[PDB]
Ligand binder design. Structure first.
Ligand SMILES: NC(=O)c1ccc[n+]([C@@H]2O[C@H](COP(=O)([O-])OP(=O)(O)OC[C@H]3O[C@@H](n4cnc5c(N)ncnc54)[C@H](OP(=O)(O)O)[C@@H]3O)[C@@H](O)[C@H]2O)c1
Ligand SMILES: NC(=O)c1ccc[n+]([C@@H]2O[C@H](COP(=O)([O-])OP(=O)(O)OC[C@H]3O[C@@H](n4cnc5c(N)ncnc54)[C@H](OP(=O)(O)O)[C@@H]3O)[C@@H](O)[C@H]2O)c1
Ligand SMILES: NC(=O)c1ccc[n+]([C@@H]2O[C@H](COP(=O)([O-])OP(=O)(O)OC[C@H]3O[C@@H](n4cnc5c(N)ncnc54)[C@H](OP(=O)(O)O)[C@@H]3O)[C@@H](O)[C@H]2O)c1
Ligand SMILES: NC(=O)c1ccc[n+]([C@@H]2O[C@H](COP(=O)([O-])OP(=O)(O)OC[C@H]3O[C@@H](n4cnc5c(N)ncnc54)[C@H](OP(=O)(O)O)[C@@H]3O)[C@@H](O)[C@H]2O)c1
Lengths: 251, 251, 251, 251
């Protein structure tokens, strides 16, 4: 079990990619603390994963709120004695249309949850990882960071920013033995992406436009994340891995 | 005169790269409106460029203020009858240290001026460009967007975000015949960059680390911006050009 | 005349992009030597350009032949006293199909003319540029280097190799004050690309698939090349500029 | 065992990164056929891995020879019934100096072993993978493809070409359900890379120069390759993963 005795936080982990990641980390031996905004979602997720015999607890954490971030870390520290792994997976996107039409308020919300919360969550775990001799951070971006989704401009820009955040954190935290990498999913079937593939007609347009044979599933993302969070990836930092089924990204 | 009869706004154009850009656009035939936060800097710059026989006026514009952005555009419309070119050059960096220590307030200032103000300035000019049958927008990022400068993390992240912003704007404004490109300077001698190349020992270390033969000067950036803002670049959009004297960037 | 008194070689310059580049360099003040494989194509091109008042002469040069390369440089040296600029534009593509079916002989032809000939042509001009205090090399690649064209695999791979060649030459020739940059055209209307945009149905499919408003013309490439070959671009080396009308390339 | 019952070929697998990959694939359940040019090296490697209880056989295969490539595939088919995985790891570099001084003979050798042999090896395995319903190909490039090593220009160019080859093969083989990915190692301690980390002066220098805390070991590359060759990576194709310990690569 590659993550035996490790303690992982996964934000936004009560559905979709975050849940698949949390499940896999726990299957690979970690103690996982799951979280999201709504208590009912946390409760259901914890119950499901505990029912699979996994070492999982959970609490509400809206990543945009400082007190919630601090309480999430405190929970891991108090139940398990520290934190080894952070998977930062939360995102918001309250906008669709031409980028130039997005309001200042839309930009503030997207930049706060998608970019600032990521770095502030990382700041919250770093001192705990230092106590453990190091750790791993994985940030969830998007292939739209490289090749933008039509009509998702502000979101896409926040995801490009995360590419840069990954690189800067990896350089700046290397002296602390903390690795920082990034997952850039393609079109993965989830509630957050659902509108893009709800109609069979829109789904088939997406597949032709993205040049993919199938849509991804949340579990298509879980293996690479578990691997990157493991000591077997000790010479991998500052790296983005695209999980996009062949859709274009970068050289 | 490749920009004869064109009207250009250059933000943050009372020193450094923005001044060199404003000078060159005007030498190339444009009517240029220069601006920055301080009236004395605007006055000095306008006097200098007028004294060189260039068609230049100026006003105060703090790009982070909606009223200032609107008034800048209105000034160009009222004097010259429209706007053809926007060069968005303003940036702030209130931070020098390890990225993990930057507070929410530091992130808010950097993201507001460096990212949000860029898009909101673009939104302010687009309707005027549409009336003219098209236009050119040039956003100033940094080679740090690709290869981060040490101690400059939050700033570097904002500059990466601008690579994304350029791409999204280029796609979305193409139907309106508005091109959007980006200049990514390397180590250029300006007041803003002084900490990096100040002392002889730090300068020699920067040249060896960056693998450059000389530091750049502001005028080294001006020609490409003028070219990109011209109709001779009509099939060039969505592009970032690095002006870095051979320092590393990307394939 | 930004290239007044400069001497330029443009390979493969009797049609298409090469011809547009040669015309523009000469319009901007350079003495240009054009060349290609067939004397008839050379004669037609020299007649046209001399008819426009331009300082152009020509010779046969198949870039894959060492003797031809040597004689081309010697011609420029004899006519004009040296060489300042090399634009390397030749390419071959004897293949249209799935990459897995191309034989060793197809690869040998493509790699020889598209890659080896480029570096060997550069080697031939370097000593002449040294005598002049420096010079400029521009290599013509393709947006297919980043996002491969369908059925053009072996060619696309050669074009990616040229990105690497540009970077390596720019680093290794900087001490000689020789800059090396690359032009990566998108879908430009030429004889070479005819099968891709020929019938109206395939043209509309290419414009949608590439996300462009129009196809490019050879002259759309000429301005950036002239600029990069000028002393106004003295702080630009190791850079690829895509001329693709907003088709996808890279951050 | 993520690769249980799978059959893998790893070229150039009797030392260094190739050996670590072969070892790990076999530890993860695969039947592996190792190979390289010299029978003594093959024998030694097979003996070592068999001694560890791994399902390994070997044969001589100079990847530049068609008959050797054909016979390697045939061996796996005759012993195991098919081929699921190809790891293409062979490389040559008979040159050290300025790229411009590399002769045609040098270029021919590098392009033949490093680029052509890779695609020809892939062609040899594709029909066998089709009989199995799909498969995985992993090409070994280098971080030098993005940021060239000094004095290794022709080699670096060949590695950049492999980034393009990976992308083109991934697109063109997707209809056959064959995934194609690439490993780009950084500074890994091996015989091949010895010149970059000779004595204590050049080792501590290149750590500061490349911005890494340690040199890599061949096993640092093995986990990602095994992962990418597994069905857990079924939504990952056309991807390059850098294993570079924080050395610069790309966004
Ligand atoms: N789906 C795709 O095609 C795809 C593609 C590219 C990128 N992504 C990225 O993948 C990540 C996960 O998205 P997903 O598609 O897997 O979403 P999903 O299935 O819709 O799940 C969203 C999860 O986020 C939680 N959440 C939302 N806002 C939160 C906040 N402020 N703080 C904490 N938790 C929050 C939700 O629970 P609560 O409602 O209880 O808060 C839920 O657990 C995001 O970074 C997204 O940008 C997804
Ligand atoms: N120098 C480098 O090595 C380097 C490298 C990469 C990128 N860049 C980029 O180049 C651009 C220009 O920087 P520089 O180095 O040329 O700077 P500089 O010489 O120090 O000049 C800064 C200019 O910006 C104005 N300014 C500052 N904040 C402003 C605001 N909020 N609104 C409007 N104007 C403002 C200043 O005038 P006031 O004080 O009157 O406002 C002044 O005209 C920036 O985007 C920077 O990030 C520079
Ligand atoms: N057209 C596009 O959409 C496009 C897109 C991406 C890249 N490009 C690149 O642009 C460059 C120019 O191509 P083009 O489309 O402009 O072609 P074009 O209009 O067909 O012109 C081809 C030119 O190359 C010459 N030529 C061919 N083989 C040669 C050789 N071995 N040695 C010397 N000259 C040779 C031809 O003259 P002779 O017959 O007399 O030899 C002719 O002058 C190439 O590098 C190409 O890969 C074009
Ligand atoms: N080490 C690094 O820092 C590093 C960095 C970037 C990339 N790489 C890449 O990693 C890969 C592995 O290199 P390495 O450093 O691990 O090498 P290594 O430890 O020196 O081993 C070289 C292996 O290749 C075999 N070989 C050489 N030429 C061959 C040929 N023509 N056909 C078949 N086998 C051949 C050798 O055995 P025989 O003598 O018996 O043929 C030996 O097994 C290469 O693609 C290399 O470019 C390594």
């Amino acid at each position: 079990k590659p993550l035996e005795n490790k303690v992982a936080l996964v934000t936004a982990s009560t559905d979709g990619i975050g849940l698949a990641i949390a499940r896999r980390l726990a299957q690979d031996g970690a103690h996982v603390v799951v979280s999201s905004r709504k208590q009912e979602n946390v409760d259901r997720t914890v119950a499901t994963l505990q029912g699979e015999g996994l070492s999982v607890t959970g609490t509400v954490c809206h990543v945009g709120k400082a007190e919630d971030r601090e309480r999430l870390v405190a929970m891991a520290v108090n139940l398990h004695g520290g934190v080894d792994i952070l998977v930062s997976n939360a995102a918001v996107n309250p906008f669709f249309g031409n980028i130039i039409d997005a309001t200042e308020e839309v930009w503030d919300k997207i930049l706060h949850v998608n970019v600032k919360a990521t770095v502030l969550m990382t700041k919250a775990v770093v001192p705990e990882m230092e106590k453990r001799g190091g750790g791993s951070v994985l940030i969830v971006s998007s292939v739209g960071a490289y090749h933008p989704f039509p009509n998702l401009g502000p979101y896409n820009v926040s995801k490009t920013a995360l590419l840069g955040l990954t690189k800067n954190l990896a350089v700046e935290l290397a002296p602390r033995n903390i690795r920082v990498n990034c997952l850039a999913p393609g079109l993965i079937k989830t509630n957050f992406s659902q509108v893009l593939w709800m109609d069979k007609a829109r789904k088939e347009y997406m597949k032709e436009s993205l040049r993919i044979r199938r849509l991804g599933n949340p579990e298509d993302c879980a293996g690479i994340v578990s691997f990157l969070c493991s000591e077997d990836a000790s010479y991998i930092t500052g790296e983005t891995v695209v999980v996009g089924g062949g859709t274009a990204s970068r050289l």
